Amino acid sequence: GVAAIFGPSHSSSANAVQSICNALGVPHIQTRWKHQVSDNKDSFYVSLYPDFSSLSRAILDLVQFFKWKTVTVVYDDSTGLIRLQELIKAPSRYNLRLKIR
Amino acid sequence: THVLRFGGIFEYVESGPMGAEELAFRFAVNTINRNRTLLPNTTLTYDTQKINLYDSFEASKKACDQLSLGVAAIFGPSHSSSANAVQSICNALGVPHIQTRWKHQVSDNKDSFYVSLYPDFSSLSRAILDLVQFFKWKTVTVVYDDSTGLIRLQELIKAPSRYNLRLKIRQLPADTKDAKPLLKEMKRGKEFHVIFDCSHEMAAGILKQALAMGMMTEYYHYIFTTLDLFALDVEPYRYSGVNMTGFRILNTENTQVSSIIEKWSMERLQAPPKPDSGLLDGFMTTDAALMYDAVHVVSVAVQQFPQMTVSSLQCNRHKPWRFGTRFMSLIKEAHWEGLTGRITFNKTNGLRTDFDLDVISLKEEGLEKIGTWDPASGLNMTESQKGKPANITDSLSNRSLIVTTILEEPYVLFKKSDKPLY
Amino acid sequence: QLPADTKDAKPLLKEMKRGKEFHVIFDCSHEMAAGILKQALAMGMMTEYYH
Ligand SMILES: *[C@@H]1O[C@H](CO)[C@@H](O[C@@H]2O[C@H](CO)[C@@H](O[C@@H]3O[C@H](CO[C@H]4O[C@H](CO)[C@@H](O)[C@H](O)[C@@H]4O)[C@@H](O)[C@H](O[C@H]4O[C@H](CO)[C@@H](O)[C@H](O)[C@@H]4O)[C@@H]3O)[C@H](O)[C@H]2NC(C)=O)[C@H](O)[C@H]1NC(C)=O
Ligand SMILES: *[C@@H]1O[C@H](CO)[C@@H](O[C@@H]2O[C@H](CO)[C@@H](O)[C@H](O)[C@H]2NC(C)=O)[C@H](O)[C@H]1NC(C)=O
Ligand SMILES: *[C@@H]1O[C@H](CO)[C@@H](O)[C@H](O)[C@H]1NC(C)=O
Ligand SMILES: *[C@@H]1O[C@H](CO)[C@@H](O)[C@H](O)[C@H]1NC(C)=O
Ligand SMILES: *[C@@H]1O[C@H](CO)[C@@H](O)[C@H](O)[C@H]1NC(C)=O
Numbered sequence: 079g080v081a082a083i084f085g086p087s088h089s090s091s092a093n094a095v096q097s098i099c100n101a102l103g104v105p106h107i108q109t110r111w112k113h114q115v116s117d118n119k120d121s122f123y124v125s126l127y128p129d130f131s132s133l134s135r136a137i138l139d140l141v142q143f144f145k146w147k148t149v150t151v152v153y154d155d156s157t158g159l160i161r162l163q164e165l166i167k168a169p170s171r172y173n174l175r176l177k178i179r
Numbered sequence: 180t181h182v183l184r185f186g187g188i189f190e191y192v193e194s195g196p197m198g199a200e201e202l203a204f205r206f207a208v209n210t211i212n213r214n215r216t217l218l219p220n221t222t223l224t225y226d227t228q229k230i231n232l233y234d235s236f237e238a239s240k241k242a243c244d245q246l247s248l249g250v251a252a253i254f255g256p257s258h259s260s261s262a263n264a265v266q267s268i269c270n271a272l273g274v275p276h277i278q279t280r281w282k283h284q285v286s287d288n289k290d291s292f293y294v295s296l297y298p299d300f301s302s303l304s305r306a307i308l309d310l311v312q313f314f315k316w317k318t319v320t321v322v323y324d325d326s327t328g329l330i331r332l333q334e335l336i337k338a339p340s341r342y343n344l345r346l347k348i349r350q351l352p353a354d355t356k357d358a359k360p361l362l363k364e365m366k367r368g369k370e371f372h373v374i375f376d377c378s379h380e381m382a383a384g385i386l387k388q389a390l391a392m393g394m395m396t397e398y399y400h401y402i403f404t405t406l407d408l409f410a411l412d413v414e415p416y417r418y419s420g421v422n423m424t425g426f427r428i429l430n431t432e433n434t435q436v437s438s439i440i441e442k443w444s445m446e447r448l449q450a451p452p453k454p455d456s457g458l459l460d461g462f463m464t465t466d467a468a469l470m471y472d473a474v475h476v477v478s479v480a481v482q483q484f485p486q487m488t489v490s491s492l493q494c495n496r497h498k499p500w501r502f503g504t505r506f507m508s509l510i511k512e513a514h515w516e517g518l519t520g521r522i523t524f525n526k527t528n529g530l531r532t533d534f535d536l537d538v539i540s541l542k543e544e545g546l547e548k549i550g551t552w553d554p555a556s557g558l559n560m561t562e563s564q565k566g567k568p569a570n571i572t573d574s575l576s577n578r579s580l581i582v583t584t585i586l587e588e589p590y591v592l593f594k595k596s597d598k599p600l601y
Numbered sequence: 602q603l604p605a606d607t608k609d610a611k612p613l614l615k616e617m618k619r620g621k622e623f624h625v626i627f628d629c630s631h632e633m634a635a636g637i638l639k640q641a642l643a644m645g646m647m648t649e650y651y652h
Pocket of ligand 1: 309554557558
C-alpha cells in the first residue's frame with residue numbers, strides 16, 4: 079500500500095515500473111532523464127529532470143553565442159545521441175560543422 | 180519427447196485479420212508439423228496471446244501466463260518498451276527469448292538468454308557507409324523518423340571523423356507523412372544524396388511527396404535503410420532516371436525460398452489491400468520472413484536435443500528452468516539456410532552480425548540486383564555493365580618530355596650554391 | 602510530333618531529355634494536355650527547369 083513510486087533511475091528499469099503505475103493508477107515520480115517513446119500512452123508520471131529537448135537549446139544558444147564553427151560533440155553511451163538530437167540537427171540550419179566521436 | 184509448446188506475444192489488430200508476424204509464426208509451426216523430415220517424432224504446438232505493444236505491464240502478465248502452463252521459448256513482443264520487459268522475465272526464469280526486431284541493447288544489460296534474428300545495425304551501418312564511398316559522395320542528408328533512428332545509424336554519424344562526408348542530419352515531421360516543408364528545405368540546400376531511415380510504409384509515403392515536389396529526377400540518389408524495397412511499388416518512379424539503392428536480405432532468387440512466398444500469398448489470399456498507399460502485394464516482408472526463420476532455428480536446437488520435458492514455472496516464485504543453460508547454447512550455435520540467407524549469431528551476444536545482403540537498385544527494367552555485400556569481404560559489386568559506351572574520353576596527358584642533354588660550358592652547366600640543389 | 606493517336610509519348614519525351622529541350626510549346630487539345638503531362642511526370646521532366 080503506497081501513494082507514489084520514486085523512480086528506479088534507469089531506462090530499462092524505469093519503463094517497466096512506469097507501466098505498472100499506469101495500470102494501477104499510483105503516480106510514478108521520476109528524477110532522471112529517460113528515452114520517452116513517442117507513443118507510450120502514459121500520463122501518470124512526472125519527470126523532475128531538466129529535459130534535453132529543452133536543455134540542448136541551451137547548449138545550442140551557447141555554441142552560437144561563442145560563434146563556434148568547429149564543434150566536436152563527444153558522448154559516452156548510445157543514448158547520448160537522443161539527448162543531443164536538437165544540437166545534431168543544427169548544421170541543417172546554421173553554419174556549424176559537427177564531428178561526432 | 181512430446182508436445183513441446185512454444186509461446187508467442189503478438190499485436191492487437193482489434194477486429195481485423197491477424198498480424199503479419201502472427202501468421203508467420205502460425206505458418207511456420209504448421210509447416211514443420213506436416214514435414215516429417217525436420218523434427219520427425221515431435222509435434223510443435225503454439226500459444227499466442229495479444230498485447231497493446233506499448234504496455235510493459237500487459238507484456239509482463241502475458242509472459243508469465245505462458246510461463247505458467249509451460250513454454251520452451253518466447254518469440255518476442257517486438258517493441259523496445261515491452262521487449263526489454265519480457266527479456267528480463269526470460270532471464271530470471273531460464274526460458275529463451277527469440278527476438279525478430281531491433282531494440283536498443285542497453286550497454287550494461289548483463290542478459291544471457293536472448294537471440295535477435297534481425298540484422299544488427301553495427302553491420303548494416305557499415306554497409307550504407309560503403310555505399311556512400313563506392314558512390315563517392317561528399318554531401319549526405321541522413322533522414323530519420325523517430326529519435327531511436329540515431330542509434331541505428333551511429334556508425335554512419337561517426338563517419339566525418341574518418342572521411343570527408345559532410346552529414347546534414349534531418350528529421351521527418353512527427354508522424355504525419357506530409358513532409359513537404361522538409362523537402363522544400365532540401366531543394367534549397369541542394370541536397371541530392373538522401374539516406375532515408377524510414378520503414379517501408381513511410382518510404383512509400385515520402386516518395387509521393389518527393390514526386391509532387393520536383394525531386395524525383397536523375398539528380399537525386401536515395402539510399403534506403405529498409406530491407407523491404409522489393410515489396411515497394413516503383414511503377415511511377417521507374418522512368419524518372421532516379422537512383423534508389425538499398426538492401427534486401429530475403430533470397431527471392433533461390434527456388435526453395437521463393438516458393439514459400441507464393442505459398443504465403445496463397446494461405447493469406449486476401450492481404451488487406453490499400454491501392455493508394457504505394458505498396459505492392461504482401462510478398463512476405465522482412466518482419467514476417469524472420470519469424471518464419473525464428474521457428475526453424477529453434478527447431479534445429481530441439482532436433483539436436485531430445486530431452487526437453489517442458490515444466491510449469493512460476494513467475495512470483497521464480498526458479499531457473501532445468502534445461503535452460505544447455506538448450507540456449509544450441510540455439511546460439513545453430514545454423515540454418517533460411518529465407519533470409521544463412522543464420523548465424525554472434526557468440527558473444529546473440530545478434531546477427533554475419534549475414535549476406537543483396538544491394539538491389541532501380542533501373543528502367545524494374546528494381547534489380549547490382550551487387551552483394553558480405554561482412555568479411557565487403558562490397559562485391561557486379562557493376563561490370565554495358566548499356567552505353569564509356570562516359571567521356573580516357574586520359575592522354577603530360578608525359579613530362581624527357582630531354583637528352585649533356586653538360587657543357589655556357590650552354591648547360593651546373594649551379595654552385597650554399598644550400599643543397601636538387 | 603506526338604505519336605499518331607496514342608498518348609504513350611515516352612519515346613518522344615526521351616528524345617527531349619537528351620536534346621536538352623526545356624521550353625516546349627505543346628499544341629494539343631485539353632484531353633491530350635492532361636495526358637502528355639502524366640508522361641512528362643513519369644519521365645523526370647516536371648521540375649523547375651522546364652517551361
Ligand atoms: C560481433 O562479433 C564481431 C566479430 O565476430 C566483433 O567484431 C566487430 O565488428 C567488426 C569486425 O572486425 C569491427 O569493425 C571493423 O573495424 C575495421 C577497423 O576498425 C578499427 O578501428 C579502431 C580505431 O579506428 C580500432 O581500435 C579497432 O580495433 C577497429 O578494429 C574496419 O575497417 C571495418 O570495416 C570493414 O568491415 C565491415 C564489416 O563490419 C564492412 O562494412 C567492410 O568490409 C569494411 O571495409 C569494420 O569497421 C569492429 O571493430 C569489431 N568490434 C567491435 C567492438 O565492434 C564484434 O565485437 C561483435 N559485436 C558486438 C560485441 O556487439
Ligand atoms: C542510376 O540511374 C541511372 C539513370 O539515371 C542508371 O543508368 C542507366 O541504366 C539503365 C539500365 O537499364 C540504362 O538506361 C543505361 O545504362 C543508363 N542510362 C544512362 C542515361 O546512363 C544507373 O544504372 C543507376 N545506377 C544505380 C546504381 O542504380
Ligand atoms: C521438408 O524439408 C526439407 C528441408 O528440411 C525440404 O526439402 C522440403 O521442404 C521438405 N521435404 C520434402 C521431401 O517434402
Ligand atoms: C522416433 O521416436 C523415437 C523415440 O522412440 C526416436 O528414438 C527416434 O529418433 C525418432 N525418429 C527419428 C527419425 O528421429
Ligand atoms: C565476387 O563475385 C564473383 C561472382 O562470381 C565471384 O567470382 C568472386 O569470387 C567474388 N569475390 C571477389 C572478391 O571478387
